[PDB]
Amino acid sequence: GSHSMRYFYTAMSRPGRGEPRFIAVGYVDDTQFVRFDSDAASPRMAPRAPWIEQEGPEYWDGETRNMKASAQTYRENLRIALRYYNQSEAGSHIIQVMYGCDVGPDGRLLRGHDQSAYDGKDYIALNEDLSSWTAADTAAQITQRKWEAARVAEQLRAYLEGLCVEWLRRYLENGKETLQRADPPKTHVTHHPISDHEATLRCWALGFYPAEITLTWQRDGEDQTQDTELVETRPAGDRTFQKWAAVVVPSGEEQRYTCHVQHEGLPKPLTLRWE
């Protein structure tokens, strides 16, 4: 199947409470495999998945050195953002960054990503061509000008087409038993009377990996989008995810409703009904 590697950085200022906290996490698909937190007693890139533990001291030392340098860069970027947005040194602000690569079954680059946000709003993003930028506002246009002068997109493109895809291929091989295993959802329909007139039908999907899933209700074969309550996919804590979709149905009409489930782990989409 198709796979991704993504790093997520968060830098948060907290004036009067020390220097900004910097936390980085790395994922392969929906599996976290590394973390770095400047607030740890001894900040270090640390393993969070069993398949990365085999990496040697040169890996952990190199990643730690890079993370400590990124923490310093993002603390500087938070100072620069105050100047670009005419903001005071008194408030708490956040920079977020997400970058990485997507590969297909053959491991070739499908797409690269490198984007950032300030205070939860898009700031600048590397375009799909890996050669130009999209700036969200006039402050990001200043960074865009700096980065075009410095040929930053070329450096990012080299990482995304090179080291990013090479290391993602390595992690997929090292973690093949889990990263390359889809766990299909365990599904069932529950029934909860609301009153004498109505009942809730809830379609459950449990124990699935990766997180991407489609759960829908139909009535007489028509999708019930507006009338369906659909919870956000949620982690179970054992690598898997859960989701449910519910509809309020008139008493005795339960058999008109069917739940439809699609997931990578299912060779064919499933149809379920109450009992």
Partner: peptide, 6 residues
């Protein structure tokens, strides 16, 4: 594996 100011 992980990878200029604003």
């Amino acid at each position: 594996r992980v990878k200029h100011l604003w």
